[PDB]
């Protein structure tokens, strides 16, 4: 089972003859490519909706609204910035400082990712982005500790920078321009962050995706398969979400159940044929 027609069919069949769902899945599977992820959430309005996010985007927002560049949309745009990846929460600006001075002379903006950025550092950073000393932005790392630390290396290798690990012999005070990651663009809003056209080698990317495929067969199903493939999608493919429309919650349960059924079934068709 290959062509989007057939996929749409097994989708339609498993969905109890709802063609819309069948077409939606074939379409989604076409858009996010193989390895791309497809999930389904309860929809706000009565009509079915397919959302698609291509490339590397994670769900965290700018820590201060003052970071905003190019408003409106309350968005922050950084053209060819440097990405900074830190394993630890950032309290003081002292430990922070040298690399930032190195980038200000560099001519380029800077993006920050860590456990969190505490007050003293945010304040200093905001005032500096305001005075027009440096264009900078900061967002939290994507997940819970093991999840986020795991995704930091993904984002790192994607952008070709190196994560600063207090738990190895890199301390944040000593940091180099080469420790930084690079990207074509980054866009941040109150909700989501996006890394556009990272400069990391295609070699490294397929290396880490391959390294994640060994994690794919891991004995723990459901979410582990779900959230891991998710990471893969962010590096190579893209992510899609299908929102199920219904008038009432019981109809929502029925339709959404049929939808996940159709989803698993189409995936099954792709894998094992029909």
């Amino acid at each position: 089972c290959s062509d989007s027609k057939a996929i749409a069919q097994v989708g339609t069949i498993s969905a109890n003859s709802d063609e819309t769902v069948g077409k939606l899945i074939a379409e989604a599977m076409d858009k996010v490519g193989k390895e791309g992820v497809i999930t389904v959430e309860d929809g706000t309005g009565l009509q079915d909706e397919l959302d698609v996010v291509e490339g590397m985007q994670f769900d965290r927002g700018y820590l201060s609204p003052y970071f905003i560049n190019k408003p409106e949309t309350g968005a922050v745009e950084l053209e060819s910035p440097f990405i900074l990846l830190a394993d630890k929460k950032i309290s003081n600006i002292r430990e922070m400082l040298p690399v930032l001075e190195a980038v200000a002379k560099a001519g380029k903006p800077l993006l920050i990712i860590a456990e969190d950025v505490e007050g003293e550092a945010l304040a200093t950073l905001v005032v500096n982005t305001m005075r027009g000393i440096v264009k900078v932005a900061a967002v939290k790392a994507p997940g819970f500790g093991d999840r986020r630390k795991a995704m930091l290396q993904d984002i790192a290798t994607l952008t070709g920078g190196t994560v600063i690990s207090e738990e190895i012999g890199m301390e944040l005070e000593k940091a180099t321009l080469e420790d930084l990651g690079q990207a074509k663009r980054v866009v941040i809003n109150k909700d989501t962050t996006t890394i556009i056209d990272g400069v990391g080698e295609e070699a490294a990317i397929q290396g880490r995706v391959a390294q994640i495929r060994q994690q794919i067969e891991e004995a723990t199903s459901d979410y582990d398969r779900e959230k891991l493939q998710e990471r893969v999608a962010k590096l190579a493919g893209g992510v899609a979400v299908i929102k199920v429309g219904a008038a009432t919650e019981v109809e929502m349960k029925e339709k959404k159940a049929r939808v996940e059924d159709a989803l698993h079934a189409t995936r099954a068709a792709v894998e094992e044929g029909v």
Partner: protein, 97 residues
């Protein structure tokens, strides 16, 4: 309206430089921030040891100086302006023109 320091004590006004300037060109700072330097307005008689004599205060007046801000220094405000009172023992160094 002019206050004269006695013995080892000197009175200087800090220059408000908006701290750092860290550590190079050019950054601002939020916490751990305050003027560490200032110009000397007036000077006391001198130290008294053994009563060999009162050996004055190696720090002349209208000098630009670097100092340490301890508990020893206290700030008082004369007409229209706040200034600080400290002992030469608290003074670290002097900048030359």
């Amino acid at each position: 309206m002019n206050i004269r320091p006695l013995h080892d004590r000197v009175i200087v006004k800090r220059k408000e430089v908006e701290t750092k300037s860290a550590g190079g060109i050019v950054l601002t700072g939020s916490a751990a921030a305050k003027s560490t330097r200032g110009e000397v307005l007036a000077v006391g008689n001198g130290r008294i040891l053994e009563n060999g004599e009162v050996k004055p205060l190696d720090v002349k007046v209208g000098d630009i100086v670097i100092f340490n801000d301890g508990y020893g220094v206290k700030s008082e405000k004369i007409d229209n302006e706040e200034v600080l009172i400290m002992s030469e023992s608290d003074i670290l160094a002097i900048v030359e023109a």
